[PDB]
């Protein structure tokens, strides 16, 4: 009986948490008793009838006394398509934590179940320290809340990529990352972890939950036991409690590579044998190429390394069919040079620009850049995308170059996926649908390949959109900023061939204007009078 296995393994406290999440996500408090009811059945489960019945079927059959037409695993695919003083007073603590847990679980669908359990334990720790503390619980709580929202966005990515593309693509992704993370490990060890990681991910994307928490626990078990062959950065991670220990290995930094590593060229470009090796064990052979390239290059995005492996694969497929293969693929490393330099220059130019402008004007510059490229997107969407891209700048450009491409990749991949989700439910651009459609190694390059839209006809002048009101002085910095960034996008839609010099001079005018009248004694009068000098300034610059 699986329900028993996982009872015996997960525990009781963890089992109950796990049932709390999936059930909650599927149904949108009344049936919380049913989750405590399931535990009583589980004790019953461990030759009783209804016991050893399939886990999903028992959950699938039940909750649906929301289609419910076939109640099978082929239905699940259809289903997937469809106050400091008071907080301490609750501190039955177990009840208080459980309500807190439901609420996070209720809020987002694709949260990775295993991670959710971990944050709760940190939340308890802060309360236990805080009540003894004369008052800083709120900063610890804020810390944890901010981290969670991003995970739901990355997970959506992972699962869609697995549906979009086969496990071969997901395993390859994994091989690339773990080689970076665990360079001193040999290939057979890395391969072992990826198969395990894939199953745990494949299942939670499946939404079984159930085993992946047990499979995550076993995987975390395995590493700490076998540190000798994995990473010299695992020690501390591997002295913690289980949910902390596990979540911690997800976050562990890159280990140093072995010193005096050989060049990959012998055995991948210098050997007569490679077409034979490729024919004897193709995907293994290619897997090992990626292992060797990756472990030498923590300064590379995973996707980049996937392009290189792809390039190499394409080169063997043509070269090994040619007259003298050895000659034909002798130059292949010269092919990798431009693939590596395109992302590096792009990081170089955009950080140069961010450094010299600061977050806010950087955002303004991106706003100009992407409006011209895709003027048909709605103004609120252009503002949010550009705003988020700017923050990517501030998070990544701080790091030296060696750390930049993986950081960019990390955050930019979530932006581009959120963006593509929006575009699907209200398309406005064929170029964007295509960049969203294309293979993951090509998504970002395709977006990078967008040009200005020379067909776009200017928006007619409207006066309201470029007038500010005194109420703007009451707003937070974020909302005031958005106000002006809305004007800028609208300015570009009205003057789409104006230089970025003229466009920025006006945007600074918007800034100087709001700055000046928000200091004035009589604001209402400043906003009306100086409002004329702004109109004459933009007219001077742009007409």
């Amino acid at each position, epitope marked *: 009986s699986e329900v028993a296995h996982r009872f015996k393994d997960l525990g009781e406290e963890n089992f109950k948490a796990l049932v709390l999440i999936a059930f909650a996500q599927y149904l949108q408090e009344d049936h919380v008793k049913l989750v405590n009811e399931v535990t009583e059945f589980a004790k019953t489960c461990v030759s009783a009838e209804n016991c050893d019945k399939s886990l999903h079927t028992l959950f699938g059959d039940k909750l649906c006394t929301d289609c419910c037409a076939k109640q099978e695993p082929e239905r699940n695919e259809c289903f997937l398509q469809h106050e400091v003083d008071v907080m301490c007073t609750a501190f039955n603590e177990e009840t208080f934590l459980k309500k807190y847990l439901y609420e996070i679980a209720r809020r987002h669908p694709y949260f990775y179940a295993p991670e959710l359990l971990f944050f709760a334990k940190r939340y308890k720790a802060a309360f236990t320290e805080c009540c003894q503390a004369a008052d800083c619980l709120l900063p610890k709580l804020d810390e944890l809340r901010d981290e969670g929202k991003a995970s739901s966005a990355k997970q959506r990515l992972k699962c869609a990529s697995l549906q979009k593309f086969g496990e071969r693509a997901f395993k390859a992704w994994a091989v690339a990352r773990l080689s970076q993370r665990f360079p001193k490990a*040999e*290939f*057979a*060890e890395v391969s*072992k972890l990826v198969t395990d990681l894939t199953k745990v991910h494949t299942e939670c994307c499946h939404g079984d939950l159930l085993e992946c928490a047990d499979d995550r626990a076993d995987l975390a078990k*395995y590493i700490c*036991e*076998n540190q*000798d*062959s994995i990473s010299s950065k695992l020690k501390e991670c591997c002295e913690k409690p289980l949910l902390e220990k596990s979540h911690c290995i997800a976050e562990v930094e890159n280990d140093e590579m072995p010193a005096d590593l*050989p060049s990959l060229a*012998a*055995d991948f470009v210098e*050997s007569k*044998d490679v077409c*034979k*090796n*490729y024919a*004897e*064990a193709k995907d*293994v*052979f290619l897997g*090992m190429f990626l292992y060797e390239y990756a472990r030498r290059h923590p300064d590379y995005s995973v996707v980049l390394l996937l392009r290189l492996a792809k390039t190499y694969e394409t080169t063997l497929e043509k070269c090994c069919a040619a007259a003298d293969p050895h000659e034909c693929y002798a130059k292949v490393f010269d092919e990798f040079k431009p693939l590596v330099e395109e992302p590096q220059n792009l990081i170089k130019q955009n950080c140069e620009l961010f450094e010299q402008l600061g977050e806010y004007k950087f955002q303004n510059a991106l706003l100009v850049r992407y409006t011209k490229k895709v003027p048909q997107v709605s103004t609120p969407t252009l503002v949010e995308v550009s705003r988020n891209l700017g923050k990517v700048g501030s998070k990544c450009c701080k790091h030296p170059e060696a750390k930049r491409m993986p950081c960019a990749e990390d955050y930019l991949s979530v932006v581009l996926n959120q963006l593509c989700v929006l575009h699907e439910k209200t398309p406005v651009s064929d170029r964007v649908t295509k960049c969203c459609t294309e293979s993951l190694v090509n998504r970002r390059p395709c977006f990078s390949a967008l040009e200005v839209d020379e067909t776009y006809v200017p928006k007619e002048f409207n006066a309201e959109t470029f007038t500010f009101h005194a109420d703007i002085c009451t707003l937070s910095e974020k909302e005031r900023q958005i106000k002006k960034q809305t004007a800028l996008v609208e300015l570009v839609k009205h003057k789409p061939k104006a230089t970025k010099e003229q466009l920025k001079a006006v945007m600074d005018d918007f800034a100087a204007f709001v700055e000046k009248c928000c200091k004035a004694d009589d604001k209402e009068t400043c906003f009306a009078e100086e409002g004329k000098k702004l109109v004459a300034a933009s007219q001077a610059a742009l007409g």
Partner: nanobody, 126 residues
Framework: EVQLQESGGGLVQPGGSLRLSCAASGFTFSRYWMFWVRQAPGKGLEWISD????????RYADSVKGRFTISRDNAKNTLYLQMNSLRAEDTAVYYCATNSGDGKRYCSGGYCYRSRGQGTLVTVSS
């Protein structure tokens, strides 16, 4: 410097059993994986069992699972393969292999090794 050397082969018969062994030289045994791969009369290499460096993980091709066991002794630099319930189809030259060293890779039968022993012949004739 890397040296693998199989032992323990000869003629045996249906139902019976046999143990194979391999000694290691060159680089240390404890830090790497080890592999047993076989070659039946009219075939190429079948990869049949794997072991991690610490001995904490093992893998078995379907055709030998349940009946075979792989294990090691890191002190003696010695890999073992314990074979039970032998059949006709287990006839083959058994080898052992590893990916230790910075030697050339050699792919065959759907995997790649850097070093292999000279391989010991086992015959399972009724």
């Amino acid at each position: 410097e890397v040296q693998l050397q199989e032992s323990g082969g000869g003629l045996v018969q249906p139902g019976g059993s046999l143990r194979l062994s391999c000694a290691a030289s060159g680089f240390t045994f404890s830090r790497y994986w080890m592999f047993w791969v076989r070659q039946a009369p009219g075939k190429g290499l079948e990869w049949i069992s794997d072991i991690n460096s610490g001995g904490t993980y093992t893998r078995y091709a379907d055709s030998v699972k349940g009946r075979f066991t792989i294990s090691r002794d890191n002190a003696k630099n010695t890999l073992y393969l314990q074979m039970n319930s032998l059949r006709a189809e287990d006839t083959a030259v058994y080898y052992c292999a590893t990916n230790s060293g910075d030697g050339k890779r050699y792919c065959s039968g759907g995997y790649c090794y850097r070093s292999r022993g000279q391989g010991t012949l086992v015959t399972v004739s009724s």
